[model samples]
Target: FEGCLEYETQLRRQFSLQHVRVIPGLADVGGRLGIGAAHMLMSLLQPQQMLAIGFGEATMNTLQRLSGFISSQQIRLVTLSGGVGSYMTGIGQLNAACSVNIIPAPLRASSADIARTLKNENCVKDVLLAAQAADVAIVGIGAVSQQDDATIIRSGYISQGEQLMIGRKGAVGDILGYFFDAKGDVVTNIKIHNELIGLPLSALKTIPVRVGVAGGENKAEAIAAAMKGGYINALVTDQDTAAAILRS
Candidate 1:
């Protein structure tokens, strides 16, 4: 852990991030190192309200481990998008430990019409207001690719054709389902942003501590873009990915 301190410092200076934790060693496919970084970051804050977006494995693991840190305090946990049922399952018995709120919206809409309609719902608005009030926000940075885009493709939200189209449009990755490029500018050509039920990148900027957890060299560019865009002010990642991000 101490070995990664240098990388962490470099990341902080490179991204102008408030907090950066890099786990020393190779990036594991299972994201264990990223989760460890998340734990280390979480230990430093006592947040009253936490908004967790994206349901990637590492983010979910961090949520599961959150139970241990909330023994005496009542933290309001608000989640945006992703499979809420499975997300709750990941939180498991800890559901009773905090005030858990899920945005009353589908994970992803089948059509642009439905997506627009749902975005106008009062329930979604209410939850978004709650999400905006969060003190800390934990999120996942998703990489874009035809074969390896697990968060969007595997979730059955975006089709292969759409992925190809987005990739062609300079989309490197996503934060809260909003795709961006190397410069961290949001990709607006596609309807993926409209079809997804999650916090807008602009709204995410309002939250104080936005911690993005992701790893693997494959996601280094995406991670760097997310930080560059200022979507995440804090980061938790592995040493290899951290170095790659700095190199970018």
Candidate 2:
């Protein structure tokens, strides 16, 4: 506990450590255990250009976990995938928290049909543009390796069969209901029902920073695939997953 506290204290110092102190904290862990690492990671980065964040339960916990450890001002933050609300940054708090979500209208449609819908909806155009232009991206990798993967699935996304199919197709997990291929490639299968569109893989690697936030034992394979696929420059996970990574 002492070490964790000390680590948090030092995390708050990341901004000053580099002499950049103007922007505020964009993301905070809301209520997830051991997930606050995501918040700490982004808090200290002090993004000079762009810090596109993908917020979710896990990512929120990564932010809220660090209560006093966050100084609230160190960089610019852009919420990549639109969330339900703006609790992390709130209005007039710190950093510009823009709520944006991109959903591809193809999960329920045929593959050929889905691609056309995405383009027609204009989501692909707007989101891809933002993603390609972003300098940094902090994302949340969804973990559904449980008896139940409700929220994402029940929110009118891909059906249970579709999720299982993705798994059967060798997809370890998805970011925003977008199933990744066997090789961890974000294959354009099962429409991306994101609140906001994400940067394409080609552009993701080009960005200076791409942070992936996830936790839980179920996320082991998912995290590994994320790293293997060059999805994240930094990883924020719990002790369990961290240990699993070392062991593997």
Candidate 3:
């Protein structure tokens, strides 16, 4: 009743996770929101000569916390940058300050211009290349139905009409580019497939350490659905959200 080795192994191959660690109290509201999540993820990550992660506060904290480890281990940081890429890499300067190998994806224009700039940009080329060689990845889970007042609607990456279309098709959540239904199956009928300037879900899953950091009362169903579908290798969530996932 604790954990399933078979499932874990399957996830290991699919996610390409090297060092694995789990924290028992992600859902606790007693302390600072991100420290535990960052610490747990950093600890589980086996030191590597090169690593890649999305940019964010959690990433910043994790990198800062592991400064000595990163320096000693000579870990290189490959970031997915440009376009909606900035949605994650606002910390690029901070990332550069880490004094590691920085591989920035080429820049694409805004969501409105994605269809025009799809394969023409270097960001797309480099991100796809990086995704192939890079196994470990940490990403934030996103919701299509407006969880946390920060919905796909607010991001402006996808248009309002697009959100309507996804809603009609039953998209509950998505990891990177792979949106899914209520049952956690990836939604295939999306209209934005070509225009969405990022790695496709197929490449997204190849990552062995797809650590998803997201949780909250509102996001429970989305997180649970992702977990149930085996889309993410490890998850960092809050207690209430974890309980909600259990209840779901």
For each candidate, the alpha-carbon lDDT, in order, equals 0.76, 0.50, 0.56
TM-score (all chains, Cα) for each model: 0.90, 0.63, 0.70
Please, what are the lDDT tens digits per residue for candidate 3 over residues 45-104?
566645555544444444455555555555555553334344333333343435333334
230: Cα error in model 2, Å: 0.4
lDDT of 2 by residue, 15-129 (tens): 1121111111234322433344544454546534445655455555544543223334333444444333533432223333433333333233345444445545675557556
lDDT of 2 at 82: 35
Question: What's the best-to-worst order under TM-score?
Answer: 1, 3, 2
* Reference-based lDDT, residue 241, model 2: 57
Best by lDDT: 1
Clashes of 3: 7
The stretch of ten residues in a row with the least summed lDDT in candidate 2 is 15-24
Give candidate 1's whole-model lDDT. Answer: 0.76
Overlapping backbone residue pairs in candidate 2 total 21
Q: Which ten residues in a row have the lowest lDDT in candidate 1?
A: 26-35
